[PDB]
Design a protein around this motif. Structure first.
Motif, PDB file in Angstrom:
ATOM      1  N   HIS A  13       0.827  -1.205   0.000  1.00  0.00           N
ATOM      2  CA  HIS A  13       0.000   0.000   0.000  1.00  0.00           C
ATOM      3  C   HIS A  13       0.857   1.248   0.000  1.00  0.00           C
ATOM      4  N   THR A  14       1.893   1.297   0.841  1.00  0.00           N
ATOM      5  CA  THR A  14       2.725   2.497   0.841  1.00  0.00           C
ATOM      6  C   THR A  14       3.473   2.610  -0.469  1.00  0.00           C
ATOM      7  N   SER A  15       3.878   1.468  -1.064  1.00  0.00           N
ATOM      8  CA  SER A  15       4.563   1.557  -2.352  1.00  0.00           C
ATOM      9  C   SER A  15       3.649   2.076  -3.453  1.00  0.00           C
ATOM     10  N   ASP A  16       2.357   1.745  -3.406  1.00  0.00           N
ATOM     11  CA  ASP A  16       1.432   2.264  -4.405  1.00  0.00           C
ATOM     12  C   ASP A  16       1.278   3.776  -4.268  1.00  0.00           C
ATOM     13  N   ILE A  17       1.222   4.267  -3.039  1.00  0.00           N
ATOM     14  CA  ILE A  17       1.217   5.713  -2.815  1.00  0.00           C
ATOM     15  C   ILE A  17       2.477   6.320  -3.388  1.00  0.00           C
ATOM     16  N   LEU A  18       3.626   5.769  -3.016  1.00  0.00           N
ATOM     17  CA  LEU A  18       4.890   6.389  -3.377  1.00  0.00           C
ATOM     18  C   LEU A  18       5.205   6.293  -4.862  1.00  0.00           C
ATOM     19  N   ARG A  19       4.637   5.321  -5.585  1.00  0.00           N
ATOM     20  CA  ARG A  19       4.828   5.258  -7.029  1.00  0.00           C
ATOM     21  C   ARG A  19       4.255   6.490  -7.711  1.00  0.00           C
TER      22      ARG A  19
END
Length: 135
Positions: free
Chosen positions: A73-79
Protein backbone atom coordinates in the motif's frame (compact mmCIF):
# COMPACT_ATOMS: atom_id res chain seq x y z
CA UNK A 1 -17.59 10.83 9.69
CA UNK A 2 -15.73 7.62 8.91
CA UNK A 3 -12.24 9.12 9.16
CA UNK A 4 -12.77 10.41 12.68
CA UNK A 5 -14.58 7.27 13.77
CA UNK A 6 -11.75 5.09 12.48
CA UNK A 7 -9.34 7.28 14.39
CA UNK A 8 -11.44 7.02 17.58
CA UNK A 9 -11.54 3.23 17.24
CA UNK A 10 -7.81 3.03 16.63
CA UNK A 11 -7.14 4.93 19.87
CA UNK A 12 -9.18 2.31 21.72
CA UNK A 13 -7.02 -0.45 20.21
CA UNK A 14 -9.87 -1.58 17.95
CA UNK A 15 -7.75 -2.19 14.88
CA UNK A 16 -10.15 -4.42 12.92
CA UNK A 17 -13.04 -2.03 13.59
CA UNK A 18 -10.90 0.97 12.66
CA UNK A 19 -9.66 -0.79 9.49
CA UNK A 20 -13.24 -1.34 8.35
CA UNK A 21 -14.09 2.34 8.78
CA UNK A 22 -11.00 3.44 6.89
CA UNK A 23 -11.60 0.97 4.04
CA UNK A 24 -15.22 2.08 3.75
CA UNK A 25 -14.03 5.69 3.57
CA UNK A 26 -11.36 4.93 0.97
CA UNK A 27 -13.78 3.10 -1.31
CA UNK A 28 -16.27 5.96 -1.02
CA UNK A 29 -13.67 8.60 -1.90
CA UNK A 30 -12.32 6.45 -4.74
CA UNK A 31 -15.86 6.31 -6.10
CA UNK A 32 -16.08 10.10 -5.95
CA UNK A 33 -12.72 10.26 -7.76
CA UNK A 34 -14.17 8.28 -10.68
CA UNK A 35 -16.41 11.29 -11.35
CA UNK A 36 -13.41 13.62 -11.62
CA UNK A 37 -10.68 13.97 -14.22
CA UNK A 38 -7.57 12.20 -12.87
CA UNK A 39 -4.73 14.44 -11.67
CA UNK A 40 -6.79 17.60 -11.99
CA UNK A 41 -7.51 19.62 -8.86
CA UNK A 42 -10.74 18.01 -7.66
CA UNK A 43 -9.26 14.55 -8.08
CA UNK A 44 -6.10 15.64 -6.24
CA UNK A 45 -8.05 17.06 -3.29
CA UNK A 46 -9.72 13.67 -2.87
CA UNK A 47 -6.37 11.91 -3.37
CA UNK A 48 -4.93 13.68 -0.32
CA UNK A 49 -7.90 12.54 1.74
CA UNK A 50 -7.48 8.98 0.48
CA UNK A 51 -3.75 8.98 1.19
CA UNK A 52 -4.30 9.99 4.81
CA UNK A 53 -6.88 7.21 5.11
CA UNK A 54 -4.58 4.61 3.50
CA UNK A 55 -1.76 5.53 5.86
CA UNK A 56 -4.12 5.26 8.83
CA UNK A 57 -5.27 1.89 7.52
CA UNK A 58 -1.61 0.89 7.27
CA UNK A 59 -1.26 1.74 10.98
CA UNK A 60 -3.93 -0.89 11.68
CA UNK A 61 -2.13 -3.35 9.40
CA UNK A 62 1.12 -2.74 11.30
CA UNK A 63 -0.64 -3.66 14.57
CA UNK A 64 -1.86 -6.83 12.81
CA UNK A 65 1.68 -7.60 11.53
CA UNK A 66 0.45 -7.45 7.92
CA UNK A 67 3.81 -5.96 6.99
CA UNK A 68 3.96 -7.15 3.37
CA UNK A 69 0.53 -5.58 2.78
CA UNK A 70 1.78 -2.28 4.27
CA UNK A 71 4.75 -2.47 1.90
CA UNK A 72 2.34 -2.82 -1.02
CA UNK A 73 0.00 0.00 0.00
CA UNK A 74 2.73 2.50 0.84
CA UNK A 75 4.56 1.56 -2.35
CA UNK A 76 1.43 2.26 -4.41
CA UNK A 77 1.22 5.71 -2.82
CA UNK A 78 4.89 6.39 -3.38
CA UNK A 79 4.83 5.26 -7.03
CA UNK A 80 2.50 8.19 -7.74
CA UNK A 81 3.51 10.56 -4.93
CA UNK A 82 7.26 10.32 -4.38
CA UNK A 83 7.38 13.23 -1.92
CA UNK A 84 5.10 11.95 0.85
CA UNK A 85 7.35 11.74 3.90
CA UNK A 86 4.84 9.81 5.98
CA UNK A 87 4.52 7.07 3.36
CA UNK A 88 8.29 6.51 3.43
CA UNK A 89 8.19 6.50 7.22
CA UNK A 90 5.40 3.92 7.39
CA UNK A 91 7.04 1.81 4.70
CA UNK A 92 10.37 1.95 6.53
CA UNK A 93 8.70 0.62 9.68
CA UNK A 94 7.21 -2.30 7.77
CA UNK A 95 10.52 -3.02 6.06
CA UNK A 96 12.30 -3.08 9.39
CA UNK A 97 9.80 -5.51 10.89
CA UNK A 98 10.40 -7.98 8.06
CA UNK A 99 14.22 -7.65 8.22
CA UNK A 100 14.62 -5.67 4.95
CA UNK A 101 17.53 -3.71 6.36
CA UNK A 102 18.68 -1.96 3.18
CA UNK A 103 15.15 -0.97 2.15
CA UNK A 104 14.27 0.31 5.63
CA UNK A 105 17.47 2.36 5.69
CA UNK A 106 16.84 3.79 2.22
CA UNK A 107 13.33 4.90 3.21
CA UNK A 108 14.57 6.45 6.46
CA UNK A 109 17.26 8.29 4.49
CA UNK A 110 14.51 9.68 2.23
CA UNK A 111 12.60 10.72 5.35
CA UNK A 112 15.67 12.57 6.68
CA UNK A 113 16.22 14.25 3.34
CA UNK A 114 12.62 15.39 2.87
CA UNK A 115 11.95 16.41 6.51
CA UNK A 116 15.08 17.00 8.60
CA UNK A 117 13.08 17.53 11.79
CA UNK A 118 12.38 13.78 11.74
CA UNK A 119 15.99 13.03 12.74
CA UNK A 120 15.04 11.95 16.27
CA UNK A 121 12.26 9.73 14.92
CA UNK A 122 14.66 8.23 12.37
CA UNK A 123 17.25 7.44 15.08
CA UNK A 124 14.50 5.60 16.95
CA UNK A 125 13.48 3.58 13.88
CA UNK A 126 17.13 2.75 13.22
CA UNK A 127 17.49 1.45 16.77
CA UNK A 128 14.38 -0.69 16.29
CA UNK A 129 15.76 -1.98 13.00
CA UNK A 130 19.10 -2.85 14.64
CA UNK A 131 17.20 -4.79 17.31
CA UNK A 132 15.29 -6.70 14.61
CA UNK A 133 18.45 -7.40 12.63
CA UNK A 134 20.27 -8.78 15.69
CA UNK A 135 18.71 -12.02 14.36
Amino acid sequence: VLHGEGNRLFKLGRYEEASSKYQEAIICLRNLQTKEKPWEVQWLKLEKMINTLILNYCQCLLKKEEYYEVLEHTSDILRHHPGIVKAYYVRARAHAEVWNEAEAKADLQKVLELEPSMQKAVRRELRLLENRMAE
